[PDB]
Amino acid sequence: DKLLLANWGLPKAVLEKYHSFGVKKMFEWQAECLLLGQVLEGKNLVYSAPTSAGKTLVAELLILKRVLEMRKKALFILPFVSVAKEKKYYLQSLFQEVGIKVDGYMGSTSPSRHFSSLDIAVCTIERANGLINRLIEENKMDLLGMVVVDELHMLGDSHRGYLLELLLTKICYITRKSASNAVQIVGMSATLPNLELVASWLNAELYHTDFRPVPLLESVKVGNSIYDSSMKLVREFEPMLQVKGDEDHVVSLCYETICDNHSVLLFCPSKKWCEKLADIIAREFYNLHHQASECPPVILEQKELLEVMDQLRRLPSGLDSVLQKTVPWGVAFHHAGLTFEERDIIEGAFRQGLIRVLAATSTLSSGVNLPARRVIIRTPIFGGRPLDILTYKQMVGRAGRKGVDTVGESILICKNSEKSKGIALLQGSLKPVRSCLQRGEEVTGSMIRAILEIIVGGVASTSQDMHTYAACTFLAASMGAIEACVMWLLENEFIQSTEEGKVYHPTHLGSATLSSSLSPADTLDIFADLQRAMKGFVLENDLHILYLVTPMFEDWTTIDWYRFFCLWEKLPTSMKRVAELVGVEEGFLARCVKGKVVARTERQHRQMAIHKRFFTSLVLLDLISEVPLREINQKYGCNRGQIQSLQQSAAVYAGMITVFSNRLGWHNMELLLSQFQKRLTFGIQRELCDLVRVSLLNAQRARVLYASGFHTVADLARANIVEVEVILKNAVPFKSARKEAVEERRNMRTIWVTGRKGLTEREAAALIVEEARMILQQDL
Ligand SMILES: Nc1ncnc2c1ncn2[C@@H]1O[C@H](COP(=O)(O)OP(=O)(O)O)[C@@H](O)[C@H]1O
Ligand SMILES: [K+]
Ligand SMILES: [Mg+2]
């Protein structure tokens, strides 16, 4: 009665966009989450709910509550680029009927529109923290109205999860310096034990629920028997048609689900098991339906299965060999070895029902929202080690489709030996959230950085302000070291002290580090290395420049050293000079092949990182030399997933080093670097830099249009559409040495986009020419 959406004083225009697919009434917990306290007035809120319970609607009503009531700008923060991109389009579609402009600041991407001409900016953690820093230097902190944090449990421990605290703490420190509404915080996560601590730290009202529209049946199978969390038998399983192999009834379980016209997610430890399992299942699906690499069977969807394989074909990766076998039978795999474009296709196919069986890794469990009737976990041993509890809850959470299934079933297959360990996961619970700013060592990276941001930014100047900040931390909410970090910044010339007793100021090295979004620990080695490059620099190739923008803070692949030594001998003299100039000794490469001795316990054995870095720069060199992804894979021995993940990392890092050089006055160095951020992003040469401004144009399409007479956007705006269409048809990779009168493919949507409607080769060509024209006019 009262939770009817029409009784909340909702604008009429918006109320219908929600009703497009469901959403006429809310939930018991969503109405209570809004009404209790002074939350709807602007008070901060930290709420928890089970996965697939409707956490999105609660935040959205609060965001619209501020954008339209306070006429201020909102900030939506998401962990990954893939989940951030998924959220942007979902929010764009909802917030357009009232003239509300919504874009995003994600990974290497940047908005065409000014921050002043937005309403809601969608960011990742790294990019959001930088944007906040943008607002401090310009004192435009007054623009920001609220921040929404998704996955609040990443506050605890992550490669970047600590940035979430510095971000929030900075907001808590600033809002304290003005101490009617100020800055509202809406955080949400899974059930945390110390969740009450987070609500108190942020002075937020709390809400927690266990509600879930579809009941989840977590279970564990040992042999034929299936038990619940209390080891009580709930089903004695017997396989309808036996097949050979390992067979812990894995194929029979998948078959049972499909026959009831449903879909199943099958999680496997390694990337190789997923492909092997997708192959076995798809192979058995061929024999069993008929009782004894094709076209999809004739149903209502014959057209869409064909559209999917063709979209895969017209990609920079091509159509995977294993997928060509499996996809025709609604079977596929999904891991980090695949490119981000392949994974966007499969996730969409599975979400539409085109793919009924999806054998995935742990990458998907933390990825986008993707539900299924039955979830199967192959083993409690992932990567040779027992499975993490959070990963388990993320896998089994995808069981049960709201509005479709009566229940969601989860099966964890085990042996008698790993029997005890499996039950531990079903009964297990999440660990308490750590501060990631902790003291053995008096100093720590996260703390040094937090202090640098507030001093250089100019919101903490004196010594009293520092301890005022210490009160606002999540670390102090749980109930010196700060003074140690300040001295560290003094010793390394990051900060200044003047004689009005004891006031701290930023140096040029300080102001440069902040604007570059670089870590103070990393800045020291970078600053010395750059000065080293400017004393003796090679300009005949782009290798030495690439080395300066080649990131080595994390391993992106397992390098085969014997292959490396083989490429070393074949390496031209111009690139050997660059190798020597960097630190690459041939003796060390030999000592890598002969014995797999990593050593690296000693700190001066950063010698290892150097050879790893030079190996990586070679890969980046071919990448911006427009070498096919398939050649690079065979040449170096790394998958297309690792390469693409690397270039998006190097594109970002290249921008940092460029800014770092600009703030230090190093013009000559800046001048050389300022061309590789764009080239690393798309993986192109200098000529294609202009073409790739068009959204639909990537490296391959840009090359074939360049080789056909269209060099610029200007050349592309006067262009004849049907000619562009023909040129596009020529860039496609076919298995036979390719490149029936079918008047039925005049409508086949075989071209993929972002936030996509299926595009035909004709519409894509017409969109490219239309977009080229729109850009050319804005240039005058
Ligand atoms: N109050 C609601 N009433 C009906 N359906 C909802 C409601 N909130 C969300 N949904 C739908 O349920 C699905 C899952 O909810 P979601 O908000 O994704 O939960 P979570 O964010 O915890 O995964 C979404 O696709 C959404 O369209
Ligand atoms: K593009
Ligand atoms: Mg969520």
Range of the domain at 85: 12-208
Residue 521 φ then ψ, to 5°: -70, -35
- Do 194 and 306 lie in a common domain? no
Site to substitute for ligand 1 among 18, 28, 56, most atoms within 8 A of C-beta: 56
Of the candidates 268, 455, 274, 490, which has an alpha carbon nearest to the alpha carbon of residue 380? 268
How many A from CA of 169 to the centre of ligand 1?
30
Technique behind this structure?
A: X-ray
3-state secondary structure string across 144-191:
EEEEEECCHHHHCCCCCCCHHHHHHHHHHHHHHHCCCCCCEEEEEECC
Coil, strand or helix at 227? strand
Confirm or deny that 429 is annotated as ligand binding. no
Angle at 551 between CA 336 and CA 660, to 5 degrees: 135
Q: Output the DSSP codes for 545-565.
A: HHHHT---SS--S---HHHHH
Q: Are residues 156 and 253 in the same domain?
A: no
Under DSSP, is residue 107 helix (H, G, I), strand (E, B) or coil? coil
Cβ 371 vs Cβ 400: under 8 Å: yes
Q: Which tokens belong to 299?
A: 């149903």
Residue 140 assigned ligand-binding role:
no
162 and 226 in a common domain:
no
Residues having CB closer than 6 A to ligand 1 are 22-23, 26-27, 30, 49, 51-57, 369, 402
DSSP state of 327: G
Q: Does 246 lie in the same domain as 203?
A: no
How far is residue 237's CA from residue 376's CA, in Å, rounded to a whole number?
14
**Is 251 in the same domain as 300?**
yes
Q: Does the annotation flag 297 for ligand binding?
A: no
Sheet architecture: strand order including 233-236: 233-236, 225-227, 216-222, 408-414, 374-377, 264-267, 357-360, 331-334
Instruction: Give the number of the atom of ligand 1 that is nearest the alpha carbon of residue 213.
Output: 12
**Greatest CA separation for the chain:** 91
Strand partners, 497: 504
| 172 and 71 in a common domain | yes
**In Å, what is the CA distance from 385 to each residue of 221, 266, 536?**
20, 19, 47
How many other C-beta atoms can be found within 10 angstroms of the C-beta atom of residue 319? Answer: 20
* DSSP designation for 207: E
Pocket test for ligand 1, best of 17, 52, 401 (most atoms within 8 A of CB): 52
The whole-angstrom separation of Cα 249 and Cα 413 is 9
Q: What are the residues whose beta carbons fall under 8 Å from the beta carbon of 533, sequence distance 6 or more?
A: 544, 548, 669
As a whole number of angstroms, the distance between CA 679 and CA 668 comes to 19
Answer yes or no: do 220 and 196 share one domain: no
Amino acid type, 593: V
Residues 142, 224, single domain; the answer is no
For residues 220 and 198, membership in a common domain is answered with no
Q: Let me know whether 308 and 423 are in one domain.
A: yes
464-472 and 163-177 helices, crossing angle to 10°: 120
The tally of CA atoms less than 13 A away on the side-chain side of residue 613 is 22
CATH classification at residue 393: 3.40.50.300
In this structure, are residues 348 and 263 in contact, taking their beta carbons and an 8 Å threshold? no
What is the best residue among 402, 404, 405 to mutate for testing ligand 1's pocket, by most ligand atoms within 8 Å of CB? 402
Q: Please tell me the number of the ligand nearest to residue 691's CA.
A: 2
Q: Is 464 annotated as a binding residue?
A: no
Pair 16, 107 in one domain: yes
Q: Residue 78 is which amino acid?
A: L
Backbone angles phi, psi at 164, to 5 degrees: -65, -30
Q: Rounded to 5 degrees, what angle do the CA atoms 112, 150, 70 make?
A: 65
- Residue the block writes with tokens 């902790």: 438
**Same-domain check for residues 148 and 284:** no
Residues having C-beta closer than 5 Å to ion ligand 2: 692
In the chain, the amino acid numbered 549 is V
User: How many whole angstroms from its chain centre is CA 152?
Assistant: 16
Task: Tell me how far apart the alpha carbons of residues 640 and 397 are, in angstroms, rounded to a whole number.
Answer: 29
CA distance 214 to 400: 6
* Residue 441 CA neighbour count, 13 Å, CB half: 9
